[PDB]
Amino acid sequence: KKVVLSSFSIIGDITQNIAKDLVTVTTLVEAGNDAHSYQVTSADAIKIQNADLILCNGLHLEETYMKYFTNLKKGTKIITVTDGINPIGVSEDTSVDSEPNPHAWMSLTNAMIYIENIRKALTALDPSNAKKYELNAREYSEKIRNSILPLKTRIEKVDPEKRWFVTSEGCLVYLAEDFGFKSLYLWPINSDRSPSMMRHAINQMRSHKIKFIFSESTNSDQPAKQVAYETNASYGGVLYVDSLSKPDGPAPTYLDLLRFSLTKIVDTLF
Structure with missing residues (x-):
């Protein structure tokens, strides 16, 4: 059974809805901690060793602990699950360039992109289960849209x-x-x-x-x-x-x- 380590609780939960126990989903920054300022422990280093795939937010969220994602198992990739989201800068003055704001998951559109990137990575890791990640990703995407779209509609x-x-x-x-x-x-x-x-x-x-x-x-x-x-x-x-x-x-x-x-x-x- 493959092991997939998510950087933080939100990515862990998404991944669990797509994999549905086809893989073991672990989480580095557990619920209740700040993902940006986390201290990686000795035990955490075990999670990292056991990982067959590492799922990060990117947009600098993990920037202080990227260095711990080293001495990895052969073949273990680090995937950025925000690929294809145009970054929004931490500047309120959108003139100047600046570090990216990491909070891309607070978006209906972007939820679908997180899901898609994770589906893709799970499928490249474990291709004999492609049809199941396919179905799961669609179901989950629908579930999100069904709950959240009526809120959008009201907000609009x-x-x-x-x-x-x-x-x-x-x-x-x-x-x-x-x-x-x-x-x-x-x-x-x-x-x-x-x-x-x-x-x-x-x-x-x-x-x-x-x-x-x-x-x-x-x-x-x-x-x-x-x-x-x-x-x-x-x-x-x-x-x-x-x-x-x-x-x-x-x-x-x-x-x-x-x-x-x-x-x-x-x-x-x-």
Whole structure:
């Protein structure tokens, strides 16, 4: 039985829906840890040795621990499951070039690309099961579309002047792009804050009469609430974007994570 190591919980869950036990799916950065600032342990080095295939997000998400994906089993490839997603830069000033924002999985379109890239890699690893990964990938893709599309459809009725997703981390930039909304946030990447970015958000919210700002499940709510106060906006609550929740939390699977967060967004913007 082949072993497929996913860099973090979200990619692990996607991969499990496509493979459905045809392979053993393991996860490096388990739910509840920051994927960008993780420390790889001795035990983790065993997971890495056992891997027949390694699935990374790319977009620099794993940049601090790429070096641990070395001395690998012969034939073990590292696949970037975001291949074909045009990166969005960590610059809010989209003039300058900048490091990529890693959060490509917060997108209906991109969910389909993650699935496709993983299907492809599983199929090149284990070609005698091609027909099963094929079926599984289609089913799973459908499942995602069936849950998430009705949320898109609701979101798209928003009045254009209210088309803003305002968060703490820049976790929704790919969602904004996919659904045709503008983005505003306080810092691009949690692991990394700027007083000027906060000032800029405040000014932008006042200027565009933006009504809500969110925080997320792995960062503090304090800055969002302060910005709400200073802008006469409302604090929107906590979104799940950077990790699956624990099993009894609201986002134990990638589908549940998209559904939860998009539901919360929709429910606050109407």
